[PDB]
Amino acid sequence: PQWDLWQSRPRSEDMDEALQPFMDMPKSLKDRRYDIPWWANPFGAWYLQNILSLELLKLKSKTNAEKIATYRSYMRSLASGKDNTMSDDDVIRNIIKERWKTLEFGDRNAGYPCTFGDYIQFLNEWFKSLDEEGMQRLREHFDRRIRPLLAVMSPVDILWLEALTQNSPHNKEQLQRKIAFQTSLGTPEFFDMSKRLRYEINEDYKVRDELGPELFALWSKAPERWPPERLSKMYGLDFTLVRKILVWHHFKACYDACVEPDWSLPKRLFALEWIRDVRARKHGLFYGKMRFAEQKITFYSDRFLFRDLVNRREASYANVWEMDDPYRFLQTEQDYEDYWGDNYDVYRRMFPEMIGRTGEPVQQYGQMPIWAGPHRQHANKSEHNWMFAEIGVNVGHEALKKLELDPTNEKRRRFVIRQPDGTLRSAKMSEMRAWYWKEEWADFRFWAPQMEWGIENTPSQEQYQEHVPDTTDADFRKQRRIQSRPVKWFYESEVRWPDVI
Amino acid sequence: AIKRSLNVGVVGMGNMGVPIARNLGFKARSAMYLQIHSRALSKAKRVCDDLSVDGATCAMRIHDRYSTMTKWCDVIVLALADVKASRHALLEDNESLIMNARKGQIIVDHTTVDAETSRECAHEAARRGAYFLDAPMSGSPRACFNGQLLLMVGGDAETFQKMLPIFHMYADNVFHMGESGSGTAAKMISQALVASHNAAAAEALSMAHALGIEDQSKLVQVLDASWGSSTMLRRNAPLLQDLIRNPDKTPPTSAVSVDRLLSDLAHLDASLPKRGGEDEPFPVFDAALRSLAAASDAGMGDRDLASVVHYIEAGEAELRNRTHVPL
Amino acid sequence: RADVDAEGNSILEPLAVSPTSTLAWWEKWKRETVSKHELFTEEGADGTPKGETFEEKNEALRMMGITSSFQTKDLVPQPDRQKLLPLIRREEGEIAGSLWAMDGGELSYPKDGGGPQGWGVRLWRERQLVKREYQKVLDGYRPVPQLSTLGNSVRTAGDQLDIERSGAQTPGELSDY
């Protein structure tokens, strides 16, 4: 059915205790405990009678005026006619404040509303009745309110507060007798710092749980119109903090809705950070960070290096995101999920620069004819992929990996893969690059289509023709063309269509 | 009503619960969120840590409360040791899964239970609006690791069809026996046959030793060739031969224990219809029961089922004493 | 068919999430709000998309059905003005602790046992930092703080009475009164 705070849901008996003394409480006295409603405890009854009733009074009912008349009369008796103009809600708040302050712990039937043991039991059961969200809210309340007081108050002050809570006459007398205990109490002038500390904590919490929904709505509606960088710039927040808030909001929504969180979101918001920082760590081994990816010459050493770097930075994104131009190769949601989920590491380590794809298309070759006929067609099938890569004098140069793996190269390195069914196919980009020395860097800024052209950049035909390529001078080009073009004309020995009448 | 992955939970990290969770984690290619419940959170932490280190393809979440397990999991599978724990987890606890079940949840208990318990669990699930299946698992934990288990599912046919892709991750032979409780009945029949064949194999090897056959492999070969082949005989031939040769040896322990077999057969007897004052006269079944009880009355209840060979005559002497008491 | 595949077999479907859940609210809001292409017709004056100014942001949120509580730039909390919390975070640790918690995790709190990394030592170090800040306040490098609830409760009865009857917010205002 419906379970809430008013009607406590039935919980399991084997639940662990929340407070420390109940963990050491003996089992017999644990079994002695009854199963009672929350208000059956004297502290719960006191709360329901004093504070919860006044909280309910603000709701629309019939006895509201009847009780408000009495409370207003009491307030007028307290403060002459000044409090007549005070609002009814203000009067209720004042009464609640006074009843909270005048609360005392002592003998149950001697005037005190409830005992310290009853208060401890109520606190323990109230903590037990909380779920994960309840405990999270409890910790939030602790951080908002109690933590500044603890940070600003001395252990002597805490012990004095404990003595006040227990309200033991002899123990209070013993604590007050000590001269050092009298002199070690804190000063209100120093305790005033707790106000500013609490304000700062509440300011951070307000940032989180009030600017999270707004930033989340803006970034979910129009991520390209409101990127995290723009949101941080316009709201004065930290650029990293905005993304952290978005991630936290989405993950908390998933967790409190009992849905598996979108694990791709931290990758999509910290793509650069994910590649840079997230690593697998061994036990007992201390690790370091590479300040620079390689040993290179700085761009300040030469005037041309400086110009090259500034031009590349101009052509480069400051912060690349999921919707930007380099990620336009993820047409459908299948591509989107595949790229951003469980394979982003390999997908980003495949190629350093960001290109309009992740690899190269795979095309399959044709099998050489086998004159043995069907007596040998089976022999090229096996249980494994047989991968072959060309080596030789002209192949295997690490410094020429890009030019050797360029598909538009007539002397491209030749790779073949025989599948377990005999199919001869080409190799993927990662498969081709696996044969060279590994490159373990990435580029998240430079995007080639944004390069400058026209101003200061104009490739000229004169520079290329300075080599003077002449077909009558060198005929290797004609030889390669002859090699490429078909040769079936040689068996016909002007080409003309057949004549049939 | 959003698009997400199935929340699949496993309750009970006993001996058979760990292989099921490991199989789900290994063979779930990020198609499910794996919730793992444990009475002590340390066991759930250990299981999830071992799965993560070995390499799991699905995210996991640990639980120690049935309320959280119910609020999270879309499908729940319980692999417990005895019937009392299953009954407490399903009906008796304040956060009992079946009593607090949500309209649409599917709860499958692989623990062997009694017919009355299965009937009441199915009735409560139907009243709550959820779906319940009783699928008593058959096989050792090594067989569950190999995925070659045996499941006899009784309940909703549509629910069985929907749950088939999850069963196949740790069981290859899954049989939809029929309505609710048919899996429990089939498990009872299988356990009775197992006990009877174990007693028969023990007696056969005892008489083999008496006659003088001094090799067990050469006997099991001809037995398998002939019509006297039996799975229990094939499994227990060497251990029974060794125990007969040396009575001083104490039979080892195993996952299939004498106490558990006796409990299952007691559930079968309780669910067995009566013909009035007298019970059903099954001679072989009664002899197996008496021999197993005599074996368990020697502190050997937690050992292997092969211990019955040392207490065949103990059960016979006990029966003779009980029959001579009124004579 | 939601629970029927191509072959016709019945397939498992996740149970419906709670309709009152914030995740369901976000899903419905995304599905029912106006598309991102109709928020602004004309773009910004200088090559940039609209929505960076607070007026445009408020207009967009209104079109999406959300009333922005931070109407003005100054209404943003602006956590870069904090003088005490950053020092604590820099030296000791996360004073908040449960500010970033997913589900019972990522908690920045001292250990239960105690010792050198316990609540007592943590509070002692935090109080030492607050004492340093109060020393700065006394030396005049920082403004005198206002009157707090704890400070008022600590003060003598006469001080509390006159503070309540004067409405003073600062010890300076109390001195003037």
Binding site: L149, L161 | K45 | -
Partner: peptide
């Protein structure tokens, strides 16, 4: 290995904070 349950955080609520904070438990 053992998870920190932070049960010492709950012990601070057993100190009658209403005496000094003047009813901080409620909404404020």
């Amino acid at each position: 290995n053992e998870a920190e349950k932070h049960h010492d955080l709950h012990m601070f609520y057993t100190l009658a904070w209403w005496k000094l904070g003047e009813g901080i438990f409620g909404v404020d």
